[PDB]
Amino acid sequence: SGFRKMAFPSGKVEGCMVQVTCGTTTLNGLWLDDTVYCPRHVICTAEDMLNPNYEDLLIRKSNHSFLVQAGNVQLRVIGHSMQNCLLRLKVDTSNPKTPKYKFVRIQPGQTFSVLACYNGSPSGVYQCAMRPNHTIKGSFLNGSCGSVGFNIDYDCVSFCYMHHMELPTGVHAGTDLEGKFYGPFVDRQTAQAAGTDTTITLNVLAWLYAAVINGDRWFLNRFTTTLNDFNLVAMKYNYEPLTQDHVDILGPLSAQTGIAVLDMCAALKELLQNGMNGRTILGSTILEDEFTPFDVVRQCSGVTFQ
């Protein structure tokens, strides 16, 4: 037993990480087949970053001006182009460690793993969530740009995030692997800030099902609630409004436990209005919001990856 937030095994993604350098700027790139993907802000220096014409800067750049390091080996870049906020460097060697993969834009509240890298060399992996406000409470130091977030489904790596920047509040913003940002942010050093954030009700509910699945059920009650009434309580406590669509996503977990979502909302309503008193849930004092309905299944079922 025991219940932990787990990252996916990171091997398949580790073999895609390289180091990309343009003059003074070094960051990480993702190497899939014969293409390297990185933040287009690699072609920038100290001042530039403020406000730059990427279209324009890139035009001066030649292939030879990109230094791409995979292990001890320089990859020879033979092409370059820009795609939204990403640079696509074409290289002469197809990455022999290329896993089965796909690019996915994930929705707010959803989770993925992050392989933090510096100079092309992975440092760590953690599990996080895309916040309702389109940021991620990650952990990045300087040099981390180009680090990627992902999920795995069998043999298939689903890339969903590339790191671009840190905001005033110490949280993080980036793109999908198409170079389109999550949220309204832009890749320049201006005065953008995260909007106010809320708690991910869908995930709290999933987590409550997880508690119940592991035999933690003191918090259940014989009552129920309307979607509407729940939202009046949740939102007092800064919870994302729950929707019918969120209700359906919990369907499988509700079926497995035979507890109706609205019955569990009732329980959750009481947790908020009264606290936990002295008890814990899955040995936690707080209501966890970074496990999705699917993480709970994956984990309470011993799902593995080939």
Binding site: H41, M165, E166, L167, F185
Partner: peptide, 4 residues
């Protein structure tokens, strides 16, 4: 904003 900071470009990491």
């Amino acid at each position: 904003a900071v470009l990491x």
